[PDB]
Symmetry: C4
Subunit: 232 residues, 4 copies
């Protein structure tokens, strides 16, 4: 209810998102024989958002994502004045989580952030499945837009109350089940940033893409909902 509480909720939320989703990818996805694969990473990402949106969603709205904050602005749901502090809160929470993750991951012989990719988002030569820039662009635009659309709908005043964290968290699992092979799945500029920093090379070079594409997608989803679906 006071902005210090809200920005703390948002850094904790984005922290948890980065630590849990990227942690699952770095520590467990590829573990020999028993590892969780892409489906387990998708689940982990979506569960970070589900659990935190229930935990701190009644404090801050529970965005944990710059593209979500901006998209909700665009959809007429969030004040332009509050946007920048949220985004900074998210970027900070994210970076702390990646630093801790980097520390933990380093306690294993042979760990190499730069060479492994550190769960970084890339396209072209740095796409996991060798998808071109155009494939990356279209998937991130659609998934960002739909994500915002689901966020708008599930938090609409005519939506039964309480269930939004479930709709929204599971939307993020969905989004990763589809798009990890294309881009390692972003839809979240703060998550891309936290991780790019420690990968240190190409992730930092391509980083601009995973800022503008999700934000543009998020605005589009907000606008479609606001203009086509809301009233009544």
């Amino acid at each position: 209810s006071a902005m210090f509480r809200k920005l703390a909720a948002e850094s904790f939320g984005t922290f948890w998102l980065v630590f849990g989703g990227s942690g699952s990818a770095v520590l467990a996805a590829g573990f020999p024989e028993l590892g969780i694969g892409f489906a387990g990473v998708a689940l982990a990402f979506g569960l970070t958002v589900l659990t935190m949106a229930f935990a701190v969603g009644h404090i801050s709205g529970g965005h944990f994502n710059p593209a979500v904050t901006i998209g909700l602005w665009a959809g007429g749901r969030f004040p332009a004045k509050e946007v920048v502090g949220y985004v900074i809160a998210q970027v900070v929470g994210g970076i702390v989580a990646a630093a801790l993750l980097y520390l933990i991951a380093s306690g294993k012989t042979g760990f190499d952030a730069a060479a492994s990719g550190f769960a970084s988002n890339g396209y072209g030569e740095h796409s996991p499945g060798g998808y071109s820039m155009l494939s990356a662009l279209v998937v991130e635009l659609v998934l960002s837009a739909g994500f915002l659309l689901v966020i708008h709908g599930a938090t609409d005043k005519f939506a039964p109350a309480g269930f939004a964290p479930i709709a929204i968290g599971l939307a993020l699992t969905l989004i990763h089940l589809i798009s990890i092979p294309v881009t390692n799945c972003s839809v979240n500029p703060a998550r891309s940033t936290a991780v790019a920093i420690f990968q240190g090379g190409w992730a930092l070079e391509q980083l601009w893409f995973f800022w503008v594409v999700p934000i543009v997608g998020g605005i589009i989803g907000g606008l479609i909902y606001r203009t086509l679906l809301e009233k009544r």
Copy 2:
């Protein structure tokens, strides 16, 4: 509440269903070592319906499926007058999503819609597990009927409110966990259609099957609920 809103909700919903479920199948199911398999595809399909039914379900009823619209007509829940616009809305949303998916998938060297099947529904020689037409027929009839039955029950007036998108989305995950090996799992004529178009050959030839079988199953489920379980 106005029919333009509703038909837009239904094309967005069916779009999301096609993009997410078939996207997960085309981009991620078979990915080397880390791919999501049939269980991840089943989950993705069911999550498209869960997330969209929460998002736009309070606008359109959230059918996203011709066999569901027709089945709810049969069960006395949906007006015959509204049926055709829903079905067209669903077929259109579906086809746009498949076109986008086709674009994304094409950004990978070696992609071949026709040869891979493009997540198309087939039986006999085009069943994934080599199941005969009779196996295809019985599974789609039962799963379509049960699906409609769950949709009817979970949206019954005596069902606790709010939870239907969860019951219904998870019913679709269930349905795919069972039947992907038989038919690649349809229960949805609009999803079969969107994808058949781009596969281009046998999917278009067998396409008639995945229209009539789900619709017949859906009507049967609506009738059983209406006639045997509703009153009271």
Copy 3:
């Protein structure tokens, strides 16, 4: 509300349970490279109960399981007069689903119910992991008891309303994640029966075990809840 509705809900429910859970095991669990494994079977089983308990739970109580009906009798929640019709309804629904499953499965070259086991519950030489009779006995007793305990608690008058189908369905997923290697996981005499019939040999010989053990476990869980946890 009228007993014909209730017994129909219970046969449909138990049918769905058998068709979906055993169907997933027979058609999809072992599918080459992409199959769902034991985790996908566990999920499918639990989703049958979740989706049907939401669908028809407000009609019949949504037991779908003889050990649950008897256990709820023992826990003081269900009248002894209604028990036998429920159990028959469940056994009938179950057997129809197994017959349909048998038909579908037969549409694949090389299918052999008897040799594959047809998802039958066995111990000793017919345990999937080679577990002895004593291992089978202890796991089924504990899991049946806990299952009844969760059913009692989640449907207690002080439990927030609406959520029981989620608690109960996910309890069944849990129970299969643990015990498929020991017995192929029963906790449900009607599911064991439907499937034993078509396996035709040893499943029919060991069948007596998967009647008495779950029922005894279910009564124990009902009694613990009734006597130790209920009041207040």
Copy 4:
């Protein structure tokens, strides 16, 4: 409402947690070809807490974990007077479940608790992925703190009612998806203890770590919530 009921709920809860989560790990995680892997263990752990928190959460608060009881004390949510009986109840429930599990597991030829590890928590040479003590320390501190933070938030008075068992159970699945490779994932001193006893060697030697680290993390999460996020 009476302390005998509450302590019984807590031993049953912790019992179920140990039996189900560690059972899934011992009986099913590594099963040839069809086994559940780390993702299935993570799911099983989280489902024990989800199902029991719905079942007995309205009786005892549904902690099932010493680090949760202590963390809720620290967060101003639970009386210091009730703490010790809860912790004993949890340790007892846990140990009974591990003993039963040990009995079941012994019914398979070649079973070796000591050599397999019996799902025990270890670091360094006894980490599953060869993670050092410092990696173990940082992951358990963060995950324990976040877990307490989610428990605090989801049970806050401004959180929609009913949903906490879902937020909290799925937080535990999350936590295991991340950290099984580092420590076999504890965040729960009673679960570590029950299992260490039967592993018999190094698990007992390292056991002190998985008491103090989770408890410290839990207190930290309680304090952050109490001091930074609660009011309003």
